[PDB]
Design a protein around this motif. Sequence first.
Motif, PDB file in Angstrom:
ATOM      1  N   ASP A 140      -4.499   1.823  -5.186  1.00  0.00           N
ATOM      2  CA  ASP A 140      -4.620   2.690  -4.012  1.00  0.00           C
ATOM      3  C   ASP A 140      -3.660   3.883  -4.069  1.00  0.00           C
ATOM      4  O   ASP A 140      -2.646   3.925  -3.369  1.00  0.00           O
ATOM      5  CB  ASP A 140      -4.408   1.898  -2.715  1.00  0.00           C
ATOM      6  CG  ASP A 140      -3.222   0.957  -2.781  1.00  0.00           C
ATOM      7  OD1 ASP A 140      -2.450   1.028  -3.759  1.00  0.00           O
ATOM      8  OD2 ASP A 140      -3.058   0.150  -1.842  1.00  0.00           O
ATOM      9  N   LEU A 141      -4.001   4.854  -4.912  1.00  0.00           N
ATOM     10  CA  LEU A 141      -3.261   6.107  -5.015  1.00  0.00           C
ATOM     11  C   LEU A 141      -3.617   7.038  -3.861  1.00  0.00           C
ATOM     12  O   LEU A 141      -4.793   7.210  -3.548  1.00  0.00           O
ATOM     13  CB  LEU A 141      -3.561   6.791  -6.351  1.00  0.00           C
ATOM     14  CG  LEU A 141      -2.983   8.186  -6.601  1.00  0.00           C
ATOM     15  CD1 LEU A 141      -1.499   8.115  -6.908  1.00  0.00           C
ATOM     16  CD2 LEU A 141      -3.734   8.888  -7.724  1.00  0.00           C
ATOM     17  N   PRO A 142      -2.601   7.635  -3.217  1.00  0.00           N
ATOM     18  CA  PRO A 142      -2.836   8.611  -2.146  1.00  0.00           C
ATOM     19  C   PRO A 142      -3.658   9.804  -2.626  1.00  0.00           C
ATOM     20  O   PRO A 142      -3.437  10.295  -3.733  1.00  0.00           O
ATOM     21  CB  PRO A 142      -1.421   9.043  -1.749  1.00  0.00           C
ATOM     22  CG  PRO A 142      -0.558   7.892  -2.137  1.00  0.00           C
ATOM     23  CD  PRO A 142      -1.170   7.342  -3.390  1.00  0.00           C
ATOM     24  N   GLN A 143      -4.593  10.257  -1.794  1.00  0.00           N
ATOM     25  CA  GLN A 143      -5.510  11.334  -2.161  1.00  0.00           C
ATOM     26  C   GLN A 143      -4.785  12.636  -2.504  1.00  0.00           C
ATOM     27  O   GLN A 143      -5.242  13.405  -3.353  1.00  0.00           O
ATOM     28  CB  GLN A 143      -6.508  11.577  -1.025  1.00  0.00           C
ATOM     29  CG  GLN A 143      -7.520  12.676  -1.303  1.00  0.00           C
ATOM     30  CD  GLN A 143      -8.385  12.380  -2.511  1.00  0.00           C
ATOM     31  OE1 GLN A 143      -8.761  11.233  -2.754  1.00  0.00           O
ATOM     32  NE2 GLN A 143      -8.702  13.415  -3.280  1.00  0.00           N
ATOM     33  N   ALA A 144      -3.654  12.873  -1.847  1.00  0.00           N
ATOM     34  CA  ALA A 144      -2.898  14.110  -2.023  1.00  0.00           C
ATOM     35  C   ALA A 144      -2.425  14.303  -3.464  1.00  0.00           C
ATOM     36  O   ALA A 144      -2.339  15.430  -3.950  1.00  0.00           O
ATOM     37  CB  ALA A 144      -1.713  14.136  -1.072  1.00  0.00           C
ATOM     38  N   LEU A 145      -2.116  13.202  -4.140  1.00  0.00           N
ATOM     39  CA  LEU A 145      -1.711  13.256  -5.540  1.00  0.00           C
ATOM     40  C   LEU A 145      -2.927  13.377  -6.450  1.00  0.00           C
ATOM     41  O   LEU A 145      -2.845  13.934  -7.545  1.00  0.00           O
ATOM     42  CB  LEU A 145      -0.895  12.019  -5.915  1.00  0.00           C
ATOM     43  CG  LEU A 145       0.481  11.886  -5.265  1.00  0.00           C
ATOM     44  CD1 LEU A 145       1.041  10.501  -5.513  1.00  0.00           C
ATOM     45  CD2 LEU A 145       1.428  12.947  -5.800  1.00  0.00           C
ATOM     46  N   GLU A 146      -4.054  12.847  -5.988  1.00  0.00           N
ATOM     47  CA  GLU A 146      -5.298  12.909  -6.745  1.00  0.00           C
ATOM     48  C   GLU A 146      -5.848  14.329  -6.776  1.00  0.00           C
ATOM     49  O   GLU A 146      -6.380  14.778  -7.793  1.00  0.00           O
ATOM     50  CB  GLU A 146      -6.335  11.955  -6.148  1.00  0.00           C
ATOM     51  CG  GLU A 146      -7.718  12.069  -6.766  1.00  0.00           C
ATOM     52  CD  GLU A 146      -7.714  11.819  -8.261  1.00  0.00           C
ATOM     53  OE1 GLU A 146      -6.895  11.001  -8.731  1.00  0.00           O
ATOM     54  OE2 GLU A 146      -8.532  12.444  -8.968  1.00  0.00           O
ATOM     55  N   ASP A 147      -5.713  15.031  -5.655  1.00  0.00           N
ATOM     56  CA  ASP A 147      -6.153  16.417  -5.555  1.00  0.00           C
ATOM     57  C   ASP A 147      -5.407  17.302  -6.550  1.00  0.00           C
ATOM     58  O   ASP A 147      -5.953  18.283  -7.056  1.00  0.00           O
ATOM     59  CB  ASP A 147      -5.954  16.940  -4.131  1.00  0.00           C
ATOM     60  CG  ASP A 147      -6.858  16.253  -3.127  1.00  0.00           C
ATOM     61  OD1 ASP A 147      -8.037  16.009  -3.457  1.00  0.00           O
ATOM     62  OD2 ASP A 147      -6.390  15.957  -2.007  1.00  0.00           O
ATOM     63  N   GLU A 148      -4.159  16.944  -6.831  1.00  0.00           N
ATOM     64  CA  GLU A 148      -3.347  17.695  -7.779  1.00  0.00           C
ATOM     65  C   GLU A 148      -3.351  17.057  -9.164  1.00  0.00           C
ATOM     66  O   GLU A 148      -2.327  17.034  -9.846  1.00  0.00           O
ATOM     67  CB  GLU A 148      -1.909  17.823  -7.268  1.00  0.00           C
ATOM     68  CG  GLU A 148      -1.765  18.687  -6.025  1.00  0.00           C
ATOM     69  CD  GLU A 148      -0.327  18.793  -5.559  1.00  0.00           C
ATOM     70  OE1 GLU A 148       0.277  17.743  -5.254  1.00  0.00           O
ATOM     71  OE2 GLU A 148       0.201  19.925  -5.502  1.00  0.00           O
ATOM     72  N   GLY A 149      -4.504  16.536  -9.574  1.00  0.00           N
ATOM     73  CA  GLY A 149      -4.669  16.030 -10.926  1.00  0.00           C
ATOM     74  C   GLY A 149      -4.703  14.520 -11.064  1.00  0.00           C
ATOM     75  O   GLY A 149      -5.360  13.989 -11.960  1.00  0.00           O
ATOM     76  N   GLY A 150      -3.991  13.823 -10.184  1.00  0.00           N
ATOM     77  CA  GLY A 150      -3.919  12.375 -10.250  1.00  0.00           C
ATOM     78  C   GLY A 150      -3.075  11.903 -11.418  1.00  0.00           C
ATOM     79  O   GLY A 150      -2.053  12.508 -11.737  1.00  0.00           O
ATOM     80  N   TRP A 151      -3.506  10.826 -12.067  1.00  0.00           N
ATOM     81  CA  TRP A 151      -2.751  10.249 -13.174  1.00  0.00           C
ATOM     82  C   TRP A 151      -2.882  11.068 -14.450  1.00  0.00           C
ATOM     83  O   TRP A 151      -2.187  10.815 -15.435  1.00  0.00           O
ATOM     84  CB  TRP A 151      -3.197   8.810 -13.426  1.00  0.00           C
ATOM     85  CG  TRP A 151      -2.810   7.895 -12.319  1.00  0.00           C
ATOM     86  CD1 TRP A 151      -3.628   7.374 -11.360  1.00  0.00           C
ATOM     87  CD2 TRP A 151      -1.496   7.407 -12.035  1.00  0.00           C
ATOM     88  NE1 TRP A 151      -2.904   6.581 -10.502  1.00  0.00           N
ATOM     89  CE2 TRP A 151      -1.592   6.586 -10.895  1.00  0.00           C
ATOM     90  CE3 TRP A 151      -0.246   7.581 -12.637  1.00  0.00           C
ATOM     91  CZ2 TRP A 151      -0.487   5.940 -10.346  1.00  0.00           C
ATOM     92  CZ3 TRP A 151       0.849   6.939 -12.091  1.00  0.00           C
ATOM     93  CH2 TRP A 151       0.722   6.129 -10.956  1.00  0.00           C
ATOM     94  N   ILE A 152      -3.776  12.051 -14.426  1.00  0.00           N
ATOM     95  CA  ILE A 152      -3.932  12.971 -15.543  1.00  0.00           C
ATOM     96  C   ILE A 152      -2.640  13.748 -15.771  1.00  0.00           C
ATOM     97  O   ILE A 152      -2.230  13.971 -16.910  1.00  0.00           O
ATOM     98  CB  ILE A 152      -5.090  13.956 -15.301  1.00  0.00           C
ATOM     99  CG1 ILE A 152      -6.400  13.194 -15.095  1.00  0.00           C
ATOM    100  CG2 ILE A 152      -5.221  14.932 -16.461  1.00  0.00           C
ATOM    101  CD1 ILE A 152      -7.560  14.081 -14.729  1.00  0.00           C
ATOM    102  N   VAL A 153      -1.996  14.147 -14.678  1.00  0.00           N
ATOM    103  CA  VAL A 153      -0.759  14.916 -14.758  1.00  0.00           C
ATOM    104  C   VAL A 153       0.474  14.021 -14.658  1.00  0.00           C
ATOM    105  O   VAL A 153       0.415  12.907 -14.138  1.00  0.00           O
ATOM    106  CB  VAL A 153      -0.689  15.993 -13.656  1.00  0.00           C
ATOM    107  CG1 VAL A 153      -1.847  16.969 -13.797  1.00  0.00           C
ATOM    108  CG2 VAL A 153      -0.687  15.351 -12.278  1.00  0.00           C
ATOM    109  N   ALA A 212       0.812  -1.211   0.000  1.00  0.00           N
ATOM    110  CA  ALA A 212       0.000   0.000   0.000  1.00  0.00           C
ATOM    111  C   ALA A 212       0.849   1.265   0.000  1.00  0.00           C
ATOM    112  O   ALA A 212       1.623   1.508   0.925  1.00  0.00           O
ATOM    113  CB  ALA A 212      -0.940   0.001   1.194  1.00  0.00           C
ATOM    114  N   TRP A 213       0.690   2.061  -1.054  1.00  0.00           N
ATOM    115  CA  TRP A 213       1.320   3.375  -1.165  1.00  0.00           C
ATOM    116  C   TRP A 213       1.067   4.269   0.063  1.00  0.00           C
ATOM    117  O   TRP A 213       2.007   4.871   0.583  1.00  0.00           O
ATOM    118  CB  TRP A 213       0.837   4.068  -2.448  1.00  0.00           C
ATOM    119  CG  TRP A 213       1.668   5.231  -2.918  1.00  0.00           C
ATOM    120  CD1 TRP A 213       2.519   5.999  -2.172  1.00  0.00           C
ATOM    121  CD2 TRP A 213       1.721   5.756  -4.249  1.00  0.00           C
ATOM    122  NE1 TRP A 213       3.093   6.969  -2.958  1.00  0.00           N
ATOM    123  CE2 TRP A 213       2.621   6.841  -4.236  1.00  0.00           C
ATOM    124  CE3 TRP A 213       1.092   5.415  -5.450  1.00  0.00           C
ATOM    125  CZ2 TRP A 213       2.909   7.583  -5.379  1.00  0.00           C
ATOM    126  CZ3 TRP A 213       1.380   6.152  -6.584  1.00  0.00           C
ATOM    127  CH2 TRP A 213       2.277   7.226  -6.539  1.00  0.00           C
TER     128      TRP A 213
END
Lengths: 458, 467
Positions: free
Chosen positions: A119-132, A77-78
């Motif tokens: 299970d990607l951490p929310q903090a990276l998702e808030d900043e675009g996620g895998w889009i960026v 888990a990340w």
Amino acid sequence: MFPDGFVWGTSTAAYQIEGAVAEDGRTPSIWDTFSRTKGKVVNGDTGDVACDHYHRWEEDLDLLAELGVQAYRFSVAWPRIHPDVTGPANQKGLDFYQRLIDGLRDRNIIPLPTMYHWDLPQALEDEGGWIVRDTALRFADYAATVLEKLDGIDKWTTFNEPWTSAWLGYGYGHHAPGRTDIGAAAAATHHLLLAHGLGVQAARAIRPHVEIGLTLNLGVLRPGTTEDQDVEATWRADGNQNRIWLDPLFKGEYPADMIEHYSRWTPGFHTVQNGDLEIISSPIDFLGVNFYGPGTVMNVGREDAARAAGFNVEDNHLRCIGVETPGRPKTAMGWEVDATALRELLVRIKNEYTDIPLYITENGAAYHDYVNASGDVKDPERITYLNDHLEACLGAIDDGVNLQGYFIWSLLDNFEWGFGYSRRFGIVWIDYDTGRRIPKASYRWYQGVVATNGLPDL
Amino acid sequence: MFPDGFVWGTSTAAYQIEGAVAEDGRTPSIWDTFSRTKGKVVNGDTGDVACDHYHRWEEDLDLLAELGVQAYRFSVAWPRIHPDVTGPANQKGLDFYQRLIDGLRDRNIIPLPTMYHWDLPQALEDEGGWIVRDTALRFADYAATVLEKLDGIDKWTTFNEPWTSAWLGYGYGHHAPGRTDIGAAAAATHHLLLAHGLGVQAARAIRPHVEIGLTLNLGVLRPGTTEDQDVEATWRADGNQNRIWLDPLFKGEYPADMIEHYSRWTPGFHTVQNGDLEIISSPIDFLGVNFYGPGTVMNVGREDAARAAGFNVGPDNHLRCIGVETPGRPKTAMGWEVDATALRELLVRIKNEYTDIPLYITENGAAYHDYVNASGDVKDPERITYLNDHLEACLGAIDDGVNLQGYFIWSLLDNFEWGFGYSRRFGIVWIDYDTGRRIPKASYRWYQGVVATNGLPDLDGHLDTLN
């Protein structure tokens, strides 16, 4: 009937079985927030407790030992390793998995850990996620930490089904984070593959030692009719399912027609920079394969020809529809059953793309199980399913396909994502309220397959 | 929202929940031998232990009292009362149901027992079963025994779904005793109705003051197309499902077109002796109604025209008609199509074409794949959605002028779903079979409020509390 060094096993994920979503400094992943959003998961189910594997890990290792498998596939888990995404490594998170690895090595079971199981951490998702692109960079920093700290590992897996994280997560909105944007998913497609390449590159620097590959849910897609309209539609779904992953990994380029098809949306494949494909096509040691069932495919808006061809029958950006075959068996998920498709898949990979060692990292089926009066969980259709699909693998080995392993999904009845706990894939039944482990008929049957290294005749 | 004296309840069956099949001198029923036969029931399941209601009857009574229902339907086992039909009444069998009836009245719950819920003694089956006439006569003696030796009963039911006993049991072979013979089922059709009639008359002499009726599983059948071929194919299917029961009961005659259809098979309706129709049409105080969902019907060998029309179809046929699935509509765990508005049409049809006597929805519910979560709950929103929509249709029927005075949910407990074993779960109370534990579902708590308030809460609003 199977080879001498055939690796038997079973697969699990992190978020699906572990639970303890907050313990030891773990931060909420994208699935923590997606499941807690109403209307996203059946009955508002979350992975807070699940199988409670985080505490009952030593019971599950003993089940693996009694089952007698050569290898146990799982996920790290990340949010446990790096709660603070940019920050330092959480020692408590590294200790849990090292203890799991050590326990597996004690029982002579080869660990096959996966770095990312959605299970990607929310903090990276808030900043675009895998889009960026940034998220793909900080995966490598996460991957490097887990590559360096955790010992006792010989084989690594970067990603488990990049297609599902991207296209269900950003494209259709079924899985986390739950967006409905095509350009977002085509961007995620690149950055997931990029993050895979960075993971492989991080492996060869820190641990030349270890073999590393990735797990893909490739599909076998068949035209409903032999007309241009329907065959070409099958080619589009095929490209999205397989070729926009297989061609980059094994030929260092995206398919021409899929790039042309996804030229419309933004960001999409505009995020493809020069040199990225060389990163993505970094030579991997082995390839993970996830198969469940094929799909008969026809063109969009072609329901009448489908019914006229004898078949039965979220915006269609691929311009293709799936059609059902009346006589063909279905699982609790609604997926058709055809073991010969698994043979067609393994033979195709052998011919068209790569000749490296292949592993069936995820093969199973959901069935509506129950504890009867005696206390047993009888699932004859899962045994039939596993058996039928394994005779296809025996055929693929006879065809000459470098198949060196098979992993049943799953070891335990787990959190089945969008459907919550309402779908059971495991060969071991779970009482979620208590956390009890009841081995099903599959577990006992599979034990005989594993020990004898071959299928008993039913 | 509902009428003032509206009777809320919930239903069960003898072999499905009781268990203890070889205790206190109980003999094998047809479902004992049938389920123990190779490949008749899923996973080789039987009703040996089941919900263990024979030992846990007091726990279930407490659940019925805590649920707050006005009444509780249940089945009285024939093999438990008369192990040897020639012999006398098994007192140990009588005392179990008497103690259950006493416990029901002490908890101020109206008992509504059913004489026959598909558990015909095996000894009677060995001598022909419902095929022969003597079985119907032996039931009248059985009915007499229970009418006399069981106190506290105001409302009696003779038979639960004769169609399923006859056509699934003797015609298609899906249910006990498992025969595949059309003449046998047509014969069982008449002798079940005859046994009901004798049972009604036996009531009038033994217990004059009690009300009595029977439970029918009627259907709502829609023609797949508007052509003569399929409409008439649905009319044949309607005759089998509804009219060969309703017309004998309320018109005192069999439908002529169905007699002509079934005349080629023996024994069939040739077993109709003189004066049977008057026995069958013995005036009943109420009519039990079972309904789960409609089915679209088209002619035999017409799969292509069905797909051409826009239906889905799968891969002998004495009724000469097939079932087709409307792709858009929801299904339950059984596979049955959900359409609550069909229940309103069935109730209004019974009012217009047949009887104005009090009606009761004796069985309505759905099957879904429930599960005990980490929180220990069993949330079943689709079942609440089902029950609500069907109850909304009932309010329509009641507004329309239908004499509906009650409603019973199938079922109380997750029980032995006959052919599908324990794999399908209908109840409002979850059952752990290995321990015997019982967990009220979200539907139980929803129904508890509905019965208490005698009205429907907001459906979308109540689903929000279950996340």
